[PDB]
Amino acid sequence: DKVNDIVDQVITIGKHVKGYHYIIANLGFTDGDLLKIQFGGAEVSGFQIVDYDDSLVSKFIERW
Amino acid sequence: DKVNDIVDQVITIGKHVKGYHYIIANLGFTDGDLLKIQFGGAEVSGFQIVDYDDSLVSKFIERW
Known part of the structure; x- marks a missing residue:
């Protein structure tokens, strides 16, 4: 949650253009x-x- | 309406930073x-x- 708030602010001030490099320090990058x-x-x-490339996870999502 | 759509796209692609100059060709710039x-x-x-600095218009908004 706190990440989306920051990301939104970053875009507003325009600090999301080429030259900046962000690292999301959590286990949910695609979350x-x-x-x-x-x-x-x-x-x-x-x-x-959560590797969505695993047939195990891929099968879970199919039902989820 | 078509202006807001373009403006939104402009921000997405990031063509709203310093260097670009847009001119809204309508009588409703603040609309x-x-x-x-x-x-x-x-x-x-x-x-x-619609000059909102006119006491005439300013009075209209007061009731509007």
Whole structure:
């Protein structure tokens, strides 16, 4: 939650363009909305614990 | 309406930063939302037919 608030502020002040580099320090990188700071230009990195490429997880989502 | 759609797209692609100059070709410059491309950096100009500085208009708004 606190991440989306910051990300929103970042876009407002325009500090999401090429030159900036953000690192989301949590296990849910794809858990938040990234479509906003995705085309900004600034590189964004993070961590993902739930690999949606695993057939195990992929099957879970199919029912979820 | 078509202006807000464009303005929104402009902010998304980030073409609202310093260096760009937009001119809203209508008689309602303050009729649309400008708070979005206001802090972007790009200069925005337009036209206003309803002068809210006139005591005549100012009185109208007081009741409106």
